[PDB]
Amino acid sequence: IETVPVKLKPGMDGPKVKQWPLTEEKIKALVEICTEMEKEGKISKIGPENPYNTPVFAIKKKDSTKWRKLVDFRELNKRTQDFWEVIPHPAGLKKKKSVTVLDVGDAYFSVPLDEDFRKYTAFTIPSINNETPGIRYQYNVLPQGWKGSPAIFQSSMTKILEPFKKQNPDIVIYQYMDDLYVGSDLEIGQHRTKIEELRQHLLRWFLWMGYELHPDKWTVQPIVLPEKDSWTVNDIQKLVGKLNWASQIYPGIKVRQLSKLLRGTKALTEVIPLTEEAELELAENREILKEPVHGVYYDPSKDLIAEIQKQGQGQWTYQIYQEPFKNLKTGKYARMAHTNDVKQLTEAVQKITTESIVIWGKTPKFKLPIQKETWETWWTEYWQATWIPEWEFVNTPPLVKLWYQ
Amino acid sequence: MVPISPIETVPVKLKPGMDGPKVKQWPLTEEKIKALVEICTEMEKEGKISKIGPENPYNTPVFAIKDSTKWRKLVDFRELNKRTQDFWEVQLGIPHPAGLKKKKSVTVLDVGDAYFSVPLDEDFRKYTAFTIPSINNETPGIRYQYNVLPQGWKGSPAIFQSSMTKILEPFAAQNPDIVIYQYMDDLYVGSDLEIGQHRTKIEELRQHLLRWGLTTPDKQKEPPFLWMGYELHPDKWTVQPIVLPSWTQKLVGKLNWASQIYPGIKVRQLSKLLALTEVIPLTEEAELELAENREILKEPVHGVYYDPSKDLIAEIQKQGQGQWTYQIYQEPFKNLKTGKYARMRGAHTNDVKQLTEAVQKITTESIVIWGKTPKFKLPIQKETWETWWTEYWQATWIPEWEFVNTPPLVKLWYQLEKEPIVGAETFYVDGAANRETKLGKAGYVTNKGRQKVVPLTNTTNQKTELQAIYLALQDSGLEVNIVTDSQYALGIIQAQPDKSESELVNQIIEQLIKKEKVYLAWVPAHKGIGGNEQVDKLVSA
Numbered sequence A: 001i002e003t004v005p006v007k008l009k010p011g012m013d014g015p016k017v018k019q020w021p022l023t024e025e026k027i028k029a030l031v032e033i034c035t036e037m038e039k040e041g042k043i044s045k046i047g048p049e050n051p052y053n054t055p056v057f058a059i060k061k062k063d064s065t066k067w068r069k070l071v072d073f074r075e076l077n078k079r080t081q082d083f084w085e086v087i088p089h090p091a092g093l094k095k096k097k098s099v100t101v102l103d104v105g106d107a108y109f110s111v112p113l114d115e116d117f118r119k120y121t122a123f124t125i126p127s128i129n130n131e132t133p134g135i136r137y138q139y140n141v142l143p144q145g146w147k148g149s150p151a152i153f154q155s156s157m158t159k160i161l162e163p164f165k166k167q168n169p170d171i172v173i174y175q176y177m178d179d180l181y182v183g184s185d186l187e188i189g190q191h192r193t194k195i196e197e198l199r200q201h202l203l204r205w206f207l208w209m210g211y212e213l214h215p216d217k218w219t220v221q222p223i224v225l226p227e228k229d230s231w232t233v234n235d236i237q238k239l240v241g242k243l244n245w246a247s248q249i250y251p252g253i254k255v256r257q258l259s260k261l262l263r264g265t266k267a268l269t270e271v272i273p274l275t276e277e278a279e280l281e282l283a284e285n286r287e288i289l290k291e292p293v294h295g296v297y298y299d300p301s302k303d304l305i306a307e308i309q310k311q312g313q314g315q316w317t318y319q320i321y322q323e324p325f326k327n328l329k330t331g332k333y334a335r336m337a338h339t340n341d342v343k344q345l346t347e348a349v350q351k352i353t354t355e356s357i358v359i360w361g362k363t364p365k366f367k368l369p370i371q372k373e374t375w376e377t378w379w380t381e382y383w384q385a386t387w388i389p390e391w392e393f394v395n396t397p398p399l400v401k402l403w404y405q
Numbered sequence B: 001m002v003p004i005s006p007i008e009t010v011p012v013k014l015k016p017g018m019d020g021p022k023v024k025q026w027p028l029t030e031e032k033i034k035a036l037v038e039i040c041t042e043m044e045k046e047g048k049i050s051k052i053g054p055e056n057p058y059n060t061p062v063f064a065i066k067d068s069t070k071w072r073k074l075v076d077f078r079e080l081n082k083r084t085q086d087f088w089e090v091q092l093g094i095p096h097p098a099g100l101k102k103k104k105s106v107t108v109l110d111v112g113d114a115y116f117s118v119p120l121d122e123d124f125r126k127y128t129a130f131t132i133p134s135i136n137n138e139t140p141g142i143r144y145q146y147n148v149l150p151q152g153w154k155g156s157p158a159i160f161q162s163s164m165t166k167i168l169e170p171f172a173a174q175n176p177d178i179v180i181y182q183y184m185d186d187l188y189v190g191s192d193l194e195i196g197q198h199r200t201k202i203e204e205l206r207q208h209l210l211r212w213g214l215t216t217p218d219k220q221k222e223p224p225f226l227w228m229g230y231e232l233h234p235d236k237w238t239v240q241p242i243v244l245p246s247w248t249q250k251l252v253g254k255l256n257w258a259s260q261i262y263p264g265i266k267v268r269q270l271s272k273l274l275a276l277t278e279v280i281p282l283t284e285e286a287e288l289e290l291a292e293n294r295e296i297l298k299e300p301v302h303g304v305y306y307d308p309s310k311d312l313i314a315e316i317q318k319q320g321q322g323q324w325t326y327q328i329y330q331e332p333f334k335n336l337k338t339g340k341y342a343r344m345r346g347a348h349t350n351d352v353k354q355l356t357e358a359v360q361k362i363t364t365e366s367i368v369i370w371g372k373t374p375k376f377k378l379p380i381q382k383e384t385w386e387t388w389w390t391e392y393w394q395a396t397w398i399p400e401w402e403f404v405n406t407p408p409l410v411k412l413w414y415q416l417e418k419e420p421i422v423g424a425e426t427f428y429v430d431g432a433a434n435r436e437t438k439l440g441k442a443g444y445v446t447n448k449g450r451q452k453v454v455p456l457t458n459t460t461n462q463k464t465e466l467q468a469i470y471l472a473l474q475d476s477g478l479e480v481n482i483v484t485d486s487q488y489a490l491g492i493i494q495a496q497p498d499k500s501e502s503e504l505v506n507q508i509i510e511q512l513i514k515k516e517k518v519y520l521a522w523v524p525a526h527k528g529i530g531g532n533e534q535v536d537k538l539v540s541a
């Protein structure tokens, strides 16, 4: 009942972010959605005295044919005063055998929003060809995708679940934006049950859907070197190039004895037998690469960086780090849109974001191997998450693509 | 008295922290002061203003300008604008005529009398005060403040449109078979109804405007509506014909503007030319098409309106020299509109990437104007596209499209090998320069003992690394393996430019086009990689 006080940061105004063009079918869905929300008092029309704006669009969540409204609160979120009074990150969530993700967004709307702040949640349903003015609305209740919605709502949230938590004391529950992440160490059949049990508290105190993630994984993948019975000049040039690169991550990588083989001016396809020295040097490099890097620590103050390489044939590699060459997590995604590069990259970004929420409770900044205008034209057509991370664009082909295959 | 509904007030406020205006009433003439008193007295009779006492400390300068017949009051709100809050501009992008849909009948109404039927927020009137200096400065000037959106104030446009829209909403909701557009102090109402059933629906709208006391004049515009620089006709639209004037600039915007209906409006040699200082002659002979730009704009071209039951199609062409031309239509040669795309300023590029960017631009344009993506016809073979996107290191996509065989066709000009070529000579290349002298060398050694080192003046490490590679391309047969340590050269070649600014890159591209197979391999420098170890010695000093 009591609208919690809220204000922007010092010396900062509300967002004035232009609404981008939407297709006719997405305009229609947003109209039907916003008409019902208005009749439920969740939003209200506003007048021209409100200059603020936040982009809005429409998606279809995974395994549903119903349009969902998504608000790009990224600008609002970075200008909302950081909230306080505890969400600590549960390091056991990443270690559970299973983790389900529950869309709990709708719970937010049962809570009024501080009157003075609503004007900063302004958004526009655009019109085709600018024929009629946009439909302008502002939020009355806590909005989905807003940073302060989970914070504010943390009060009632912890109460909706004290019983379930008391009952199942080693099930791990974590919240990030509009999502609840529920981790067990049990079997899926009992997982679905204990999940559907937790879905009963919610129905009593998109809630039907979930994500079946198994944080079971292998952290930073090892660097691997070929094992061959015969080596051409080209196999050895590539190996020396890979070992040189790994040398900026690992100490004591040595290439002297392998380069000795590359003395001369031989044809690229000529088989080169290996020296006794060269084979030991390769074995010692291999041993070095088996241990992970040493001085690698997460610092919660700094940003997470996510790099993604297109490897071809529906494969994508990625690395998450904070300082270059100190990787916190690396991975590889395979066939999963075999004629659409952009749909795949978008699904990759989403999975990498989801994993980054599980491990650290925040989202990384992506470096996308795509031209800005292409990504900006198409990513919203494949997006299915209630959150959105930040990205930038790589326009020079990194030599390092090979070293992650 | 028939009760009129009140027009709800928009709460206005001044920018946070700022206070109102305190400008000084400038000296007038006895004649001008005589004129202003006549105007303000009639306006006062209308409610448009009210005489204020001495408490308001805000003043806005008032002027008089005459004459067609008489004088008119000009109140300079430039200083109150600076201090009034920001408003949501009710629209900033205009419709594009190609998005308009036809209607059998379009009636036009005059709604100017409603502009000064829109009240100003009470608590804000204080800031609209102005002084008529009195005759001979021997009495206190007369003091007024607006009760209605002032002509020239910051908020008046947004608040007016906003207010008109709220009135019209229920009528438009209950008569979906008509459309309504608002422009200046007129409204445009179109429909496909029988001329009788349309003239009645107009009567209903004047009735409905009455319920807010909006006196709608009962009285025939030209079939050519002149609107936002266009000419809207009942069946076609075009631009309002406008032309371009030997001392000279602003023809770039004019030529661009004409290019949305007239095809082939080239702007390259003209835009290449460019403070307002001096005009040089078209040394790229821009008059070969500049006189053709005058010859293109000589004949008149018209576009058609949108028919949502027909598909939407977009066709692109390569015009050469970073220039792309496109038309969007639903039936062949009945263009809805046309346009051009010019390449992004860069150092290297290729035809496939430009065409992709054209497609993205048209996609976004089309979503704006029609709310859907067009089907594309493109001058590129399906096979060419598949090869490009399956091997390009970036993610790329092109929405539904079909090949149109309109030369010139976009193609891939070369394709590097993925594995070393068996039985092709292996050239280890290398190049180096002296930062101080700008002297360097470029050269290669091959497995067959072929060798060369060429000394160079006025050069850099980057240029000599490219030149080494060029030398091996020049001196090899049709198949060749090349081994470099230049990450710079690999970065350039692996981005697959087909055209460059650097003439060295272009010569390498031209050698690449002539080969059958090229394998390019990178090794790290200063590591004794033989071949590259042997040629480094020859070329470093």
Ligand SMILES: C=CC(=O)N(C)CCc1ccc(Cl)c(Oc2cc(Cl)cc(C#N)c2)c1
Pocket (backbone or CB within 6 Å): B095, B100, B101, B102, B103, B104, B106, B179, B180, B181, B183, B188, B189, B190, B223, B225, B226, B227, B232, B233, B234, B235, B305
């Ligand atoms: C001459 C055009 C005409 O007869 N058609 C049937 C097609 C365009 C059209 C259709 C329907 C309406 Cl209602 C319409 O009215 C407008 C629309 C706009 Cl954007 C601007 C102006 C002005 N000035 C008038 C204009």
Ligand SMILES: [Mg+2]
Pocket (backbone or CB within 6 Å): B429, B430, B431, B432, B464, B465, B484, B485, B486
């Ligand atoms: Mg070199």
